[PDB]
Amino acid sequence: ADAHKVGLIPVTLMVSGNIMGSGVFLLPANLASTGGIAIYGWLVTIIGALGLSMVYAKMSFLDPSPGGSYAYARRCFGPFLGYQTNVLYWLACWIGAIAMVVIGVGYLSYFFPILKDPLVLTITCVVVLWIFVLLNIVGPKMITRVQAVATVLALIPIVGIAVFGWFWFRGETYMAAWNVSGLGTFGAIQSTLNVTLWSFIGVESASVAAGVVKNPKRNVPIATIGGVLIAAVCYVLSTTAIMGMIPNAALRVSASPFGDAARMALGDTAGAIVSFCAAAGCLGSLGGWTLLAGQTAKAAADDGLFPPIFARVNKAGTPVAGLIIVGILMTIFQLSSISPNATKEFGLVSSVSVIFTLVPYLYTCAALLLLGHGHFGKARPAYLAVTTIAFLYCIWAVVGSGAKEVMWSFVTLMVITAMYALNYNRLHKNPYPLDA
């Protein structure tokens, strides 16, 4: 409790918030490239995401350390694989933040065309970017509530259709466009896993924010599973709903499919509603990531595995100097990217960020078995089945990324292990030292 921690509801909405985020609005546009067979892809993507949820759920229950993934990998494998998880996820976070502010603010252009011009867009972003760094400095009680309101604002259309969308949905349109890809059923299913497997990055959120959730052992597991269950429901119900409402042809070339789901549904400026709700979604998610950025660095900084400045806190215990760095960085790697100008662009270096997150997922399912075997009782086979699913889920994600971004993920992994060696020799503690 004591005192400014965050409760169950905010925490869980932070999970749903970060998960659904920017993408929930573009899904039916990308599945439309393959068809209604994307339903099968979901059934596979869901049980795979429920696996990784349960893993994080049980893990955080057993050890509710602050920093989630990072924490477990330190217990399991030592300071090095700890240091690796942080650096990766910490980047995966604040690069992820950058994507939110862009996408979010970009929805607002529907209201202010003023900001399609790329320069003004970047000025607006610094502003809104620092707005949320500041909200994060007034503390996790505060941003979790701003996100909680943001994300329920963002759920309005997504339930609206998910629930009321059926009233107009039919078979004729949905089924006609069952398999537009022109690939075999298993071919298609894989081509939808390319999209949908990245839909549940975010499941870690609660377990990472353990240090700031009120009753970690009860709540982190509830927020973890619950969050993922909200996301699943929406995804499935909403994008199957849209594929029986708008014809495939129109839908796959749509910039905002929910905006179009509107212009017939409630018509007129109902796109207004959706582009506000869409913008609210991201901006909420924005702040939620920058939070999590704040926490990993904190945890790692606290065990000597990240610079001391990230461990420095104000009296409430929130890492102010830590967040101001994330804030500065995002301001640097944002001016750098004024629509070309300096060089090129660049959604590569956000894509590599998304593989950085799958590495922690992997070391966590390892950590569950390697640390947790003691506490499994007679449910041993259950926990083996589940985590191997979580494994298949992480590998099968990378199996169908682009090469280019895995290559680069891998290169940054090498450079991470070059810095550890260079920065920690002397302080390092060897399982089997040499004598002097």
Added chain:
Amino acid sequence: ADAHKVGLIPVTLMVSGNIMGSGVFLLPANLASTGGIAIYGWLVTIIGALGLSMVYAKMSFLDPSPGGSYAYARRCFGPFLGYQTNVLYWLACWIGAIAMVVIGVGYLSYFFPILKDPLVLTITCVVVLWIFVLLNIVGPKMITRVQAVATVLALIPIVGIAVFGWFWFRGETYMAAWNVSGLGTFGAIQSTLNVTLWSFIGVESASVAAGVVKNPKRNVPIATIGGVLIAAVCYVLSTTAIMGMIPNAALRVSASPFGDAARMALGDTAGAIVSFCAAAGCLGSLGGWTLLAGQTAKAAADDGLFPPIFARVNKAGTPVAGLIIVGILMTIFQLSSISPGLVSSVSVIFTLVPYLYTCAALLLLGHGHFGKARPAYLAVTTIAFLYCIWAVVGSGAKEVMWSFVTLMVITAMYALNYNRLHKNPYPLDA
């Protein structure tokens, strides 16, 4: 000493053998795609390889554990990063052996066209493949000698030209093709590093076979550095020598540039010589890898980190059952072929991972023993780092992707096979 270990010379020739191997004959054909500016690429590729040599040299001096890379990673980072190194490098080895038998036997087609036909080629390979598995079962004293002879047989042409090739050398020729790539100087340099940086895979050999080298602490470092020095000398002297001997135009479309080179000096039957020496090279290297395969699995098996069967030895101490597995596997993933290289490629990135964790291990374990040469050892190992990273920077993406995916599967198997036995730096209470 006691008793059937291997001495300095065989060890070091195993190093040079495995390094130069199949590639030393194809180098000047691939550098001919860019020109005599590949000389600059070499100067960068050399000091980078002398780094990673020195690293392995000092590491194996300090700890001369059997398994080299694997050993060090276990000390440094624990059983998991140990397990990771072995599985990788063990695959790196026996996939690498498959490549050698193919290439090696393929040179012999110059004598027996009978075996360009792809079926007969694979039958031949199983035969020769199991010839060397057997030679390896009669022990490391034996294969190291077969390799030593194989690799000095393979050095004939390579010194022949490297030394005597200068008599047909022509500055005009060499210069006129200075930069055929049509890229900027730094562009060209990078386009030659693509080839040359993979030239020194093998530096690990001696430190990996520490369990079988006579006086490990003196010899593994000598064989390590010495080996790499022999490879550098040849590479540089021989391929610059050829580029002033044969015009760029001819040279870059050559199937065997040494065959063409040699036909200028000895002439006529020089192709026979070269295709025998070229085949001797690979087949020697073939056995030397299957050796190293034998040793990692042994070392890991011995620490519970690989199946017990790989730790099982005959009275001489050599892992017979272990090698028969490698032998079977190579027989399976060979008949699997017919008709009906990526894999050989992914295997090559697998070897750069151990290199990395070794330079780490040098600093993380060795800092105690650096005395007042601290800066020297930091400078050197950071080169060794740049060398490993810069290799991967210019691989194909497809084979890094797959190297990475196999890394994930490796860590899923550790979790699945070692939970209960695993020892956590910071456990939970029950």
